[PDB]
Design a protein around this ligand. Sequence first.
Ligand SMILES: OC[C@H]1O[C@H](O[C@H]2[C@H](O)[C@@H](O)[C@H](OCC(CCCCC3CCCCC3)(CCCCC3CCCCC3)CO[C@@H]3O[C@H](CO)[C@@H](O[C@H]4O[C@H](CO)[C@@H](O)[C@H](O)[C@H]4O)[C@H](O)[C@H]3O)O[C@@H]2CO)[C@H](O)[C@@H](O)[C@@H]1O
Ligand SMILES: OC[C@H]1O[C@H](O[C@H]2[C@H](O)[C@@H](O)[C@H](OCC(CCCCC3CCCCC3)(CCCCC3CCCCC3)CO[C@@H]3O[C@H](CO)[C@@H](O[C@H]4O[C@H](CO)[C@@H](O)[C@H](O)[C@H]4O)[C@H](O)[C@H]3O)O[C@@H]2CO)[C@H](O)[C@@H](O)[C@@H]1O
Ligand SMILES: OC[C@H]1O[C@H](O[C@H]2[C@H](O)[C@@H](O)[C@H](OCC(CCCCC3CCCCC3)(CCCCC3CCCCC3)CO[C@@H]3O[C@H](CO)[C@@H](O[C@H]4O[C@H](CO)[C@@H](O)[C@H](O)[C@H]4O)[C@H](O)[C@H]3O)O[C@@H]2CO)[C@H](O)[C@@H](O)[C@@H]1O
Ligand SMILES: OC[C@H]1O[C@H](O[C@H]2[C@H](O)[C@@H](O)[C@H](OCC(CCCCC3CCCCC3)(CCCCC3CCCCC3)CO[C@@H]3O[C@H](CO)[C@@H](O[C@H]4O[C@H](CO)[C@@H](O)[C@H](O)[C@H]4O)[C@H](O)[C@H]3O)O[C@@H]2CO)[C@H](O)[C@@H](O)[C@@H]1O
Ligand SMILES: [Ca+2]
Ligand SMILES: [Ca+2]
Ligand SMILES: [Ca+2]
Ligand SMILES: [Ca+2]
Ligand SMILES: [Cl-]
Ligand SMILES: [Cl-]
Ligand SMILES: [Cl-]
Ligand SMILES: [Cl-]
Ligand SMILES: [Cl-]
Ligand SMILES: [Cl-]
Ligand SMILES: [Cl-]
Ligand SMILES: [Cl-]
Ligand SMILES: [Cl-]
Ligand SMILES: [Cl-]
Ligand SMILES: [Cl-]
Ligand SMILES: [Cl-]
Ligand SMILES: [K+]
Ligand SMILES: [K+]
Ligand SMILES: [K+]
Ligand SMILES: [K+]
Lengths: 366, 366, 366, 366, 109, 106
Amino acid sequence: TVTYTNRVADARLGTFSQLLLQWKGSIYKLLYSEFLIFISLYFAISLVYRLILSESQRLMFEKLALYCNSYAELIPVSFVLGFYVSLVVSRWWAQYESIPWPDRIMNLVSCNVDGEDEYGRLLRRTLMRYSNLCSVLILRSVSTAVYKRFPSMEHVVRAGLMTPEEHKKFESLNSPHNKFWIPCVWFSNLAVKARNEGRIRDSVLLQGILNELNTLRSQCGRLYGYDWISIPLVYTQVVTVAVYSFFLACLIGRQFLDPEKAYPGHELDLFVPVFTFLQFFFYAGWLKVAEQLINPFGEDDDDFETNWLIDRNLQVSLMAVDEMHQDLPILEKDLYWNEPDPQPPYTAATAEYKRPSFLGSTFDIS
Amino acid sequence: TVTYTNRVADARLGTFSQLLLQWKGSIYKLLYSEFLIFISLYFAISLVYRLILSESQRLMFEKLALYCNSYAELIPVSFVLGFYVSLVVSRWWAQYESIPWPDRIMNLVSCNVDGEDEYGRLLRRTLMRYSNLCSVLILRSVSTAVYKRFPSMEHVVRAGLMTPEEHKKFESLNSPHNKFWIPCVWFSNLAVKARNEGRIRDSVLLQGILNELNTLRSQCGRLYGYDWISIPLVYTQVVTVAVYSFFLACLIGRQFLDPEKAYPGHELDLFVPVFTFLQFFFYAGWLKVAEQLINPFGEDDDDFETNWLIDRNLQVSLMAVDEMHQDLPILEKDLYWNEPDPQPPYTAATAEYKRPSFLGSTFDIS
Amino acid sequence: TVTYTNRVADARLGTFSQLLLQWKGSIYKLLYSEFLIFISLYFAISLVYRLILSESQRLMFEKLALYCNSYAELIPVSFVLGFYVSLVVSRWWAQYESIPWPDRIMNLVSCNVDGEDEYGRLLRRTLMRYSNLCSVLILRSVSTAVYKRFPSMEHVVRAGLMTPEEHKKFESLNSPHNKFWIPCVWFSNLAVKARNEGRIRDSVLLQGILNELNTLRSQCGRLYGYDWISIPLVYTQVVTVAVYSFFLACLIGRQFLDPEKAYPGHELDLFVPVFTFLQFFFYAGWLKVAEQLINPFGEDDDDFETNWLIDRNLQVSLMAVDEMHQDLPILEKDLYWNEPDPQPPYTAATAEYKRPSFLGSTFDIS
Amino acid sequence: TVTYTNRVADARLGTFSQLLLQWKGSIYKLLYSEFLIFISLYFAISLVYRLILSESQRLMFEKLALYCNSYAELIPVSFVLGFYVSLVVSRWWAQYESIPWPDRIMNLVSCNVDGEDEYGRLLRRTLMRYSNLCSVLILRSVSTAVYKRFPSMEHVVRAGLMTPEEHKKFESLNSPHNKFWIPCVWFSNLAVKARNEGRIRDSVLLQGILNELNTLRSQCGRLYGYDWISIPLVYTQVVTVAVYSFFLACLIGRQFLDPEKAYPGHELDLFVPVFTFLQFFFYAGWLKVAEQLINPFGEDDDDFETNWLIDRNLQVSLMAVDEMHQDLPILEKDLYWNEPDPQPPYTAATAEYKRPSFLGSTFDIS
Amino acid sequence: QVQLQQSGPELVRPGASVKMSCKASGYTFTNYWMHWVKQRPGQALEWIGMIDPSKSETTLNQKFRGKATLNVDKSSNTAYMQLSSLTSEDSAVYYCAREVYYFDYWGQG
Amino acid sequence: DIQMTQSPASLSASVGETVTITCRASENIYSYLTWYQQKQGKSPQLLVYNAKTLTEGVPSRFSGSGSGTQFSLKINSLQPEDFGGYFCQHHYGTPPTFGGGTKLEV
Ligand SMILES: OC[C@H]1O[C@H](O[C@H]2[C@H](O)[C@@H](O)[C@H](OCC(CCCCC3CCCCC3)(CCCCC3CCCCC3)CO[C@@H]3O[C@H](CO)[C@@H](O[C@H]4O[C@H](CO)[C@@H](O)[C@H](O)[C@H]4O)[C@H](O)[C@H]3O)O[C@@H]2CO)[C@H](O)[C@@H](O)[C@@H]1O
Ligand SMILES: OC[C@H]1O[C@H](O[C@H]2[C@H](O)[C@@H](O)[C@H](OCC(CCCCC3CCCCC3)(CCCCC3CCCCC3)CO[C@@H]3O[C@H](CO)[C@@H](O[C@H]4O[C@H](CO)[C@@H](O)[C@H](O)[C@H]4O)[C@H](O)[C@H]3O)O[C@@H]2CO)[C@H](O)[C@@H](O)[C@@H]1O
Ligand SMILES: OC[C@H]1O[C@H](O[C@H]2[C@H](O)[C@@H](O)[C@H](OCC(CCCCC3CCCCC3)(CCCCC3CCCCC3)CO[C@@H]3O[C@H](CO)[C@@H](O[C@H]4O[C@H](CO)[C@@H](O)[C@H](O)[C@H]4O)[C@H](O)[C@H]3O)O[C@@H]2CO)[C@H](O)[C@@H](O)[C@@H]1O
Ligand SMILES: OC[C@H]1O[C@H](O[C@H]2[C@H](O)[C@@H](O)[C@H](OCC(CCCCC3CCCCC3)(CCCCC3CCCCC3)CO[C@@H]3O[C@H](CO)[C@@H](O[C@H]4O[C@H](CO)[C@@H](O)[C@H](O)[C@H]4O)[C@H](O)[C@H]3O)O[C@@H]2CO)[C@H](O)[C@@H](O)[C@@H]1O
Ligand SMILES: [Ca+2]
Ligand SMILES: [Ca+2]
Ligand SMILES: [Ca+2]
Ligand SMILES: [Ca+2]
Ligand SMILES: [Cl-]
Ligand SMILES: [Cl-]
Ligand SMILES: [Cl-]
Ligand SMILES: [Cl-]
Ligand SMILES: [Cl-]
Ligand SMILES: [Cl-]
Ligand SMILES: [Cl-]
Ligand SMILES: [Cl-]
Ligand SMILES: [Cl-]
Ligand SMILES: [Cl-]
Ligand SMILES: [Cl-]
Ligand SMILES: [Cl-]
Ligand SMILES: [K+]
Ligand SMILES: [K+]
Ligand SMILES: [K+]
Ligand SMILES: [K+]
C-alpha cells in the first residue's frame, strides 16, 4: 500500500536514511498532532517555571522534576511495546494472507467447466462471480474502505457484483446473521448442477473445484475472525497506560532545571530537550505502528488496498474463465528443443550473476 | 466479544486514548478490587508511619523502606510477564481457531446429498445436526458459559440439538469417557448409508464429506487438548510470585519518607504515589491480560461468545442444506458480459481509493 | 495432567492468588530440596560471620560480600531463561499434539470396512488394534510412565494390546532397530487385503484409510524425534551455569553486613533475606518450569497422562468400529423441522449470553 | 545424538546439576581452548601489572581498567545472543524435520505394488531404493559426516545404494547441477510403468504413491535450501563482534586493581576473577550453542547422526516392502473381544497412573 | 422418577428466622439449577432466587436480597432456604423447582 | 424486570367449549414462555414450554402459540379436569417473573 520495496532493494549508504524524508505513511504524519500537544505542554510548563513561579515554588518544582524524572523508565515500556507490537504485526500479516484470491478456483473453473457455447460461457462466468461475491461481501464487512464504496446491498448490485435476481434470492433466504456465506453455497450447488448437465466430466474434477471453494470460504472466515476477535482491550490499554506514564514523567522530569543550583544530571540548560523529543518520536512512533496495523483494513496510508484487489480480481477472474477457456497459443518447438543444457543469455549489467551451480557445502569447489 | 475493531480502524489523534474511557472488559474493571486493597494497605502503612510510630521507630521504618525499595525491580518482572503473556495469547488465538464451523461440511452436504424429497431433506438435516452435536458436546465440556446453558444431557435434548432417540442410542453405548466423539461416528456411518441408498453419487464425493468431518473432529480434539492440558501450574505460580514480590516491595519501599531527613531520592512528599499507582495498573493489568485469556471459554467480558456461535451455526447449517439444496437464483448475463476490462464504480467518498495496478517493485512507474 | 482450567475460567479477585495455595505440581514441591539447601548454606555462612569470624576476618568477609553482590545480575539470567524456557515450552506442546489419537482412522474404518458378520467384526477390530499397537509401541519407547507399565514385550501381549501370533510374527521379522513401525505396515497390508476381499468398496475409500494411517505414523515419528533429539546439552548447561552463578553470588553477597559499619545499601539487618529468598523462588522456580517440561513423558505431576490415553483410546477405538459399525439411531424430524430461524432456549443464568449477531465492524449497530 | 532425555525425565533435586558433570557435547569441551586463551591473557596482563609496571604506569593501567570495565555491558550482548541463537535453534529443528524418512512411501509401496513373484519383489525393492538414493544423494551434499563416507559416486555404488547400471544412466544424463533429483524422477516413471504392467491397480493408488514421493522431494529441497542459504554472514559477524567486545573489556576492566588505592568497586583482591570466568562460560558457551547448531550436519557431538539414519532406513525400507509384502500374522479374536469396556492391567509401580477419565473442566468431579 | 420432597409446615414469631429444606431424588442433583418460588393468596408467584448445586452459586431476586439465603448439601442431595427477620408478610407457601429451560418439577410446598 | 400481564383474570366456560388465555410481555422474550396449570391446594404443573412445545403428559387439546411480546394458551374441547388455575412465566433472564394467573371456572 505504501510500497518502498524497490528503494530498499540494496543495502547502500542511505538505504534507510532516505526513508526519513518520506511523508506518506510516515512517522511524522502519524505523530504530528500528538507531538504538537507534547511540545506545547512542555514549553508551557517551562515558561511557568522560568517566568511565573517564585523562588520558593521553583525549589518545589525542581524537587518535583527530580521525582518525575526518576520514573521515566524506558526498559519496562520497551518490553511491553515489543511484545504487543509483535502481536499486532503478526495478526497484520495473517489478515493479508486471509484476503481471498480467485486464481486457484479460476484455473480449475476455466479448464474443467466444458462448453464453448453461450451457456458454457454463462456457467463459468457465474461461478467465478459467486466466488468474488463471497469475497466482496466479507470485505465490506471488515473494511471501512470497502464499505464506504458499498454502503448498501444495492451498491453491490448496481456495481455489477450481484444480479437483481441474485439479490432477490438473497433476501428470500431469511437469516439474522451475515449472509456472506450464501454465494459460497450457490457456487457448490451450481458446480454440482453443472456436473449433472455433463459440463463437468468426473467427480474427481468436481470435488477438486469444491475444495478450492471451501478454501476460499476458510479465507473469508479468517477475515471475519480477526474483525470479530479484537486484541483484548485490557492488553491494548496496558500498553497505552505504560507509554503515557512515560511521557507524563518526561513532561515535568525532563524540564531544564536551574543550572546554578547545580543538580547532579542537570548542569546544562538547552531550553529545547532534543533527546527527550527524539525519545518521543521513538516510543510514540513505536506505538503508532500498532495503532496503524491493529486494523489493516481501515483507511490509513499503510492499510491494505482492498478496493483495488476487488477490481483486479473481477477483471482477471472473468477473463480467465471466459476469453481464456480452452484458448491456447500455437504450440511451437521451443528455442531449446535440441539443446539439453540451455544457456539463456544475460544482459551486460547482469552477467556477473551467471554463477556456477551450487552442488552442496560438502563438495570441494574445484 | 468486546469488539472495538471499528474504533481503531484509523490511526488518528485519540485512536488508543479513547479506549481508556471504556469500562467493559477494561483494565479498570479487572483491577478494581486488587487496586483498592493496594490503595488501602499503602495509606494504612502511611498513616502508621506519620501518626503512630515513634521517632526511633520512624528511623527503622525509613531504613526498612530503603531496603524494600531497592528490591522493586521492573526488568526481571517485565521479562517473565512478556514471555508468559505471549504464551497465553498464543494459546488464546489457537483455541479460537479450534472452534469448529459447519460451513465447510455444510457446503458439501448441501450439494452432494441428493433428493428433493422429505427423506433427502431429513437426511441432509440429520447429517448437519450430527456435526453441530459433535461441537455442542465438546463446547459444553470446555466452556462454562455453554455448560451453564446445557448443565445436563436433558438440556441438550430439550433445546433441540439432540433427539430423544439419539439420546437413547447415546446412553446405550457404554463408555466411561467423554462421548463428544459419538455424533462424529454416526455422521460417517450415516454418510455411508446415504451413499449406499444412492443419495451420494461417487465415493470421491463421499470421502470428501468424510474428510471435512474428520477436520471437525480434529477441531474438537484441539479444544479438548487446551482444556485438559493447562499451562503448567509452576509457570503460572512463578509469574504471580514475581509480580506480587514487586508490589510487596512497593508497599513499603514507595512510602513517602521524611523530607527533612533528606534521603537521596526522597526529597519530596506528595502523600499519594502517583507513578507507583501507575506502575500497579501497568503490571497488575499486564498480569490480568493472562488472567483473563488463560481460559477464553469462561464468562469474562473478553472471553469468547460461544453460545451465539452455537445459535448462529444451528440456523445457518440447516438453512444451507435444506432451503438451499439445489436451489439457485435465475442465471443472468452479468452486467460486464461484453466488457473484458470492467470498471466498477466508486462512491464519492471512495474515489481516492481507485489506484493504478501494482505491477511490481522492479517496474518503472511511468 | 494438573488441570486448573476451571479455576481460572474467570478473571476475578483471587484467580491467580488461589493457585499459590496448591501443592500438586507446584513451585513449592519442585523447589523444596533446593530451597532447603540454599536456606541452610545461607544461615550457615551467616552464623560463621556473626559468631566465628574475628573483627579483621569480618572486614574481609564484608569486602567479599560487596564483591559477590555486585555480580548478582538478574537481567542477563532473565534473558537466557526466557528464551530457553520458551524453547522448552514450545517443544512441550508440540510433543502433546504428536500423541496419536485413533479417532480419525476410527471414523473411516468403522464406516468403510463392510460386514455385519464375525469376519467383518474381526477385520475392523484388528485394524484398529494395529493402529493402537503402533502407538503403544512408540509410547513405551519415549514415556517412562508407560514403559514401567510395559517393561517387556510380554507385558504388551498379556495386557491384550498384542496377540501371541502377532508377537511371533513380530519376532520373526529380523531388525536391529525399533519395530514400532511394524503394526503400521500390517495395517496397510490388512487394509489392502480387506479391499481385495471386497470389504472395502473403492480405492478412493482405501487410500483415504491409508492416508490417516500415514498421518498416525508421522505422529509416532515426531514423538521419536523429540525423544531422540534432546535440546542441545550445551544450551541446557549454559542456563544452569547462569542461574547457579546468580545464587552463588547471593549466598555471600546477600549476607546482612554490619549495620554499624554503615555500608551504602546495607543499613538494616533483618537476619532473614526476604527478597533474596523471593528471588530464589522466582528464578529457581522459573528454571524448574524447563526442568519439568523438558521431558513431558516422565513421571512429574505436570507430565502427560499417557497411560490413561492408552486406556481411553483402546476402549473408544474398538467400540466405534465394532458396536457402532453401521449402527445408527432412529432418524426423526428435528425439533426445528418447520423452523427456518430456530431460537434455542437459555437457562436463567445464561440469558445474558444471548447476543445479537455480529455482522461486522463496518456496519452501523442500529 | 547426545541424548540425555531419560536423565531429565523427572524434575528432581539434581536433574540439571547432574548434567554439569557430563563431558560429551558439553560446554567444557566446546569452550576448552577459548577459555585457556582467556585465562592466559588475563593472568599475563595481571602479572605485568603486579610485577612489571612502574608506580606511574600502574596508575595509567588502573585508569585504563576503569575505562574498559565501564564498557563491559551484558544487556546489549544478551539481547543479540538471545535473538540470534533463537534463529539458529529454529533452523536447527527445521533441518531435522527435513531429513526424509521412507516409512510413508514404504507403507504404500509395500501394500499397493502387487506380486509375490520375483519381479514384484524386484519392483518393490527398486522403488524404495530410488527413494533412499534420492535421500543419500542430498545428505552427502549437506552433511560432512555422510560425505566423508561417500566422497565419490563410486562409494555410493560399492556401498550398495546404487547399481552400476543406474550409475551409467546417471552419467548419461548431462547436467551441470546437483543430480540428487534424478532418482526421484526414476521413481515416478517406474511407478507409472508398474501401473501399466498391472502391478498397481488404480490411478488413485498410483497418485497416492506419487504424492508421498513428491513430499520426500520437498524434504530434500529443504535440506538443500538450509545448506545453500546460510544465516547472513553480517548477522553472524555482528554477534561475535558484540561477544568479543565484551571479553576484550573484561580482559583489562576485570583486572584486580590496587586495594590500597581504594577504587570504588575494587576493594578486594582475589587474584582469580571467579565471576568474570563464570560470565565467560555463560556468554562464550551461549555463543557456542549457535556455533554448534549453525550446521547440524557436521561432525559435532550434538550434530545429527545422519549415517545411522541412512543405515536404519535402508534395512527397514526393503524389509517392509519385501519380507512384509502382503505378509500378515494370523488373525485372532482379541483378548477384549467380548469386553466393551476393557480394563488393561497395571504393574505394581504404575497403578497410581490409572486415572478417572477427564471429561472436561466444566463438569463437577463427583 | 423425579421427586422434590420439602420439609413440613412451620409456625414462628415475628423477627425470628426459619430454614426449610427440599430433598431431590430421581435425577443428578448437581446438573439442574434449583429455584425457589413464593406463593401468597391473591398475589402472583414471586421468584425468590436460584442456586447452582455444583458450585453453590446463588442468584437472588433484588426484592429478597436481605430476606432469603440459599445453599445446598450435595452429599444429601437437598437444597435449603433461610428466611430472616420474618414478618407477617413473609407468611406464604414456598416451593422449590427444578429448571430445564422451564420448571418441570415442583415440591409439594 | 420483565412484566407479565395475563388476561382474562378469570374465565367461565362449560365442558366442550374452547377458551384462550393470553400472556403479554413487557419486552421481547422470543419464544421463551411456559404455561402452568395449578389446581387449588396442589403444586403447579408444566403444560407448555418454549411457547409451543407440550410436555409429556399433556393431552393434544392443549396448544400454545405466539412469540415476542404476545403469547396465548388455547384449550379446545374442555373437560372436567381442565378446570382450575392457569398462569404463565417467561424464561428469558433473571428474575423469571410469573403472570397474574387465570381462574377457569365452569
Ligand atoms: O540500488 C541502488 C540504490 O541506490 C540509489 O538510491 C540511493 C539514492 O540515490 C541516494 O541518493 C539516497 O541516499 C541519499 C541521502 C544520503 C545522505 C545520507 C548520509 C548519512 C548517512 C548516515 C550518517 C550521516 C550521513 C539520504 C537522505 C539523508 C537525509 C537524512 C535525514 C535528515 C537527517 C540525516 C540525513 C541524501 O538525500 C537525498 O537527497 C535528495 C534530495 O534531498 C533526494 O531526492 C533526490 O532524487 C533525485 C534523483 O534524480 C535527485 O536528482 C534530486 O536531487 C532529489 O529529488 C533523495 O531521495 C535523498 O535520498 O538513497 C539511496 C541509497 O540506497 C539509486 O538511486 C537506486 O538505484 C537504488 O535505490
Ligand atoms: O476513522 C476516524 C475515527 O475518528 C473519529 O473517532 C475519534 C473521535 O471522534 C475522537 O473524538 C476520539 O478521541 C477523542 C479524545 C481525544 C482527546 C485526547 C487527546 C490526547 C492525546 C494524547 C496527549 C493528550 C491529549 C480521546 C479521549 C481522551 C481522554 C484521555 C483519558 C484521560 C487521560 C488523558 C485523555 C477525547 O475524548 C472524547 O470525548 C467524548 C466525551 O468525553 C467521547 O464520547 C463522545 O462521543 C460523541 C460522538 O457523537 C460526542 O458527541 C459526545 O461528546 C461523547 O459521547 C469520545 O469517545 C472521546 O474519545 O477518538 C477517535 C480518534 O480516533 C470518528 O468518530 C470515527 O469515524 C473514527 O473512529
Ligand atoms: O468463576 C468465579 C470463580 O470465583 C470463585 O473462586 C474464587 C474463590 O471463591 C475465592 O475464594 C478464591 O480467592 C480467595 C483468596 C482471596 C484472597 C486473596 C486476595 C489478595 C489479592 C492480592 C492482594 C492481597 C489480597 C485467594 C487465596 C489468597 C492467599 C494468598 C497466598 C498467601 C499470600 C497472599 C494471599 C482467599 O483464599 C481462599 O481461602 C480458602 C481457604 O483458605 C480456600 O479454600 C476454601 O474453599 C472452600 C469452598 O467451599 C471454602 O469453603 C473453605 O474455606 C476452603 O476450603 C480457597 O481456595 C482460597 O482461594 O479464588 C477464586 C477467585 O477466582 C468461585 O468459587 C468459582 O465459581 C470460580 O472459580
Ligand atoms: O527419575 C528419577 C531420576 O533420579 C535419579 O537420578 C538422579 C541421580 O541419582 C542423582 O544422584 C543425581 O544428582 C546427584 C548430584 C546431586 C548433588 C547436587 C545437589 C546440589 C543442588 C543445587 C544446590 C547445591 C547442591 C548431582 C551432581 C552435582 C554436582 C554439581 C556440579 C559441581 C557444582 C555443584 C554440584 C550428585 O552427583 C552425582 O554423583 C555421582 C558421582 O559423583 C554421579 O554418578 C554416580 O552414579 C552411580 C549410580 O550407580 C553411582 O553409584 C556412582 O557414585 C556414580 O558413578 C551422579 O551421576 C551424579 O549426579 O541426578 C539425578 C536427579 O534427577 C535416578 O537415578 C533416575 O531414576 C532418574 O534420573
Ligand atoms: Ca488501520
Ligand atoms: Ca477467561
Ligand atoms: Ca518431566
Ligand atoms: Ca555443527
Ligand atoms: Cl529504565
Ligand atoms: Cl470455515
Ligand atoms: Cl532532553
Ligand atoms: Cl530493575
Ligand atoms: Cl483428532
Ligand atoms: Cl510514586
Ligand atoms: Cl542486572
Ligand atoms: Cl514419518
Ligand atoms: Cl534480601
Ligand atoms: Cl549492561
Ligand atoms: Cl520441491
Ligand atoms: Cl570477577
Ligand atoms: K543508512
Ligand atoms: K493516541
Ligand atoms: K489476583
Ligand atoms: K537442580
